[PDB]
Design a protein around this motif. Structure first.
Motif, mmCIF file in Angstrom:
data_model
loop_
_atom_site.group_PDB
_atom_site.id
_atom_site.type_symbol
_atom_site.label_atom_id
_atom_site.label_comp_id
_atom_site.label_asym_id
_atom_site.label_seq_id
_atom_site.Cartn_x
_atom_site.Cartn_y
_atom_site.Cartn_z
ATOM 1 N N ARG A 1 -15.809 18.295 70.087
ATOM 2 C CA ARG A 1 -15.859 18.494 68.611
ATOM 3 C C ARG A 1 -16.775 19.676 68.288
ATOM 4 N NH1 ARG A 1 -17.239 14.651 63.608
ATOM 5 N NH2 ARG A 1 -18.573 16.044 62.428
ATOM 6 N N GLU A 2 -16.593 20.285 67.148
ATOM 7 C CA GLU A 2 -17.450 21.448 66.781
ATOM 8 C C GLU A 2 -17.658 21.472 65.265
ATOM 9 O OE1 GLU A 2 -15.713 24.897 68.327
ATOM 10 O OE2 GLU A 2 -15.874 24.283 70.386
ATOM 11 N N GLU A 3 -18.831 21.838 64.824
ATOM 12 C CA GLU A 3 -19.094 21.890 63.359
ATOM 13 C C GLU A 3 -19.360 23.337 62.940
ATOM 14 O OE1 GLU A 3 -22.334 19.591 62.093
ATOM 15 O OE2 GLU A 3 -21.713 19.555 60.030
ATOM 16 N N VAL A 4 -18.751 23.780 61.875
ATOM 17 C CA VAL A 4 -18.954 25.190 61.435
ATOM 18 C C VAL A 4 -19.331 25.215 59.954
ATOM 19 C CG1 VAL A 4 -17.973 27.475 61.683
ATOM 20 C CG2 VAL A 4 -17.015 25.559 62.966
ATOM 21 N N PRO A 5 -20.455 25.802 59.641
ATOM 22 C CA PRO A 5 -20.950 25.905 58.240
ATOM 23 C C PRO A 5 -20.217 26.990 57.447
ATOM 24 C CG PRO A 5 -22.513 26.990 59.711
ATOM 25 C CD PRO A 5 -21.378 26.430 60.598
ATOM 26 N N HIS B 1 -20.527 24.008 52.521
ATOM 27 C CA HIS B 1 -19.524 23.042 53.053
ATOM 28 C C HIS B 1 -19.425 23.195 54.572
ATOM 29 C CE1 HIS B 1 -18.161 21.748 49.139
ATOM 30 N NE2 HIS B 1 -18.340 22.996 48.704
ATOM 31 N N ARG B 2 -19.334 22.103 55.282
ATOM 32 C CA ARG B 2 -19.241 22.186 56.767
ATOM 33 C C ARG B 2 -17.886 21.645 57.225
ATOM 34 N NH1 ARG B 2 -23.802 20.373 55.125
ATOM 35 N NH2 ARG B 2 -23.175 18.211 55.337
ATOM 36 N N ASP B 3 -17.169 22.403 58.008
ATOM 37 C CA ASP B 3 -15.838 21.933 58.487
ATOM 38 C C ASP B 3 -15.939 21.539 59.962
ATOM 39 O OD1 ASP B 3 -13.317 21.376 59.050
ATOM 40 O OD2 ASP B 3 -12.459 23.242 58.399
ATOM 41 N N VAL B 4 -15.252 20.502 60.356
ATOM 42 C CA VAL B 4 -15.317 20.064 61.780
ATOM 43 C C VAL B 4 -13.969 20.328 62.454
ATOM 44 C CG1 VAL B 4 -15.778 18.134 63.298
ATOM 45 C CG2 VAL B 4 -16.941 18.296 61.094
ATOM 46 N N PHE B 5 -13.980 20.975 63.588
ATOM 47 C CA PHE B 5 -12.702 21.245 64.303
ATOM 48 C C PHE B 5 -12.710 20.526 65.654
ATOM 49 C CE2 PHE B 5 -13.665 24.649 61.420
ATOM 50 C CZ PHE B 5 -12.456 24.770 60.722
ATOM 51 N N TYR B 6 -11.575 20.054 66.092
ATOM 52 C CA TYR B 6 -11.517 19.351 67.404
ATOM 53 C C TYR B 6 -10.657 20.158 68.378
ATOM 54 C CZ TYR B 6 -13.729 15.416 65.183
ATOM 55 O OH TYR B 6 -14.635 14.601 64.534
ATOM 56 N N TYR B 7 -10.950 20.079 69.648
ATOM 57 C CA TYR B 7 -10.140 20.831 70.646
ATOM 58 C C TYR B 7 -9.667 19.876 71.745
ATOM 59 C CZ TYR B 7 -12.237 24.688 68.189
ATOM 60 O OH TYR B 7 -12.635 25.569 67.205
ATOM 61 N N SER B 8 -8.453 20.032 72.197
ATOM 62 C CA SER B 8 -7.939 19.141 73.275
ATOM 63 C C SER B 8 -8.073 19.845 74.627
ATOM 64 C CB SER B 8 -6.467 18.820 73.011
ATOM 65 O OG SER B 8 -6.127 19.226 71.692
ATOM 66 N N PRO B 9 -7.694 19.176 75.681
ATOM 67 C CA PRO B 9 -7.768 19.733 77.062
ATOM 68 C C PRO B 9 -6.998 21.049 77.197
ATOM 69 C CG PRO B 9 -7.231 17.388 77.132
ATOM 70 C CD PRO B 9 -7.152 17.810 75.667
ATOM 71 N N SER B 10 -5.966 21.228 76.419
ATOM 72 C CA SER B 10 -5.180 22.491 76.499
ATOM 73 C C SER B 10 -5.806 23.540 75.578
ATOM 74 C CB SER B 10 -3.740 22.224 76.063
ATOM 75 O OG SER B 10 -3.722 21.876 74.685
ATOM 76 N N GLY B 11 -6.855 23.188 74.888
ATOM 77 C CA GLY B 11 -7.511 24.168 73.976
ATOM 78 C C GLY B 11 -6.778 24.187 72.633
ATOM 79 N N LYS B 12 -6.072 23.136 72.318
ATOM 80 C CA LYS B 12 -5.341 23.092 71.019
ATOM 81 C C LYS B 12 -6.336 22.855 69.882
ATOM 82 C CE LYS B 12 -2.095 20.442 68.305
ATOM 83 N NZ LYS B 12 -1.037 19.393 68.351
ATOM 84 N N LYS B 13 -6.329 23.702 68.889
ATOM 85 C CA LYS B 13 -7.266 23.518 67.746
ATOM 86 C C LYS B 13 -6.565 22.743 66.629
ATOM 87 C CE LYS B 13 -10.075 25.878 64.353
ATOM 88 N NZ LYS B 13 -10.497 27.212 63.836
#
Length: 72
Positions: free
Chosen positions: A19-23, A32-44
């Motif tokens: 998981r990653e958080e970006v301000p 506002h802070r948005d959270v992005f998730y990444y899978s094993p294939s690097g899918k955002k």
């Protein structure tokens, strides 16, 4: 650092997901802070339903906290 981004792993998801958080900083869209998730294939992806639908069969994430990225 410029564009500082956090990176916490989510044990609730299968090993390989992160998981990653970006301000935000765009005029009023700042703070506002948005959270992005990444899978094993690097899918955002950024959708609760996609996390459960994708890992649905692999497991149930309906009780997964997307805003906090924690299992409750």
């Amino acid at each position: 650092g410029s564009m500082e981004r956090k990176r916490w792993e989510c044990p609730a998801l299968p090993q390989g997901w992160e998981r990653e958080e970006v301000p935000r900083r765009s005029g009023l869209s700042a703070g506002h802070r948005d959270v992005f998730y990444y899978s094993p294939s690097g899918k955002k992806f950024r959708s609760k339903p996609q996390l459960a639908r994708y890992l649905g069969g692999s497991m149930d994430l309906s009780t997964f906290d997307f805003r906090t990225g924690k299992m409750l």
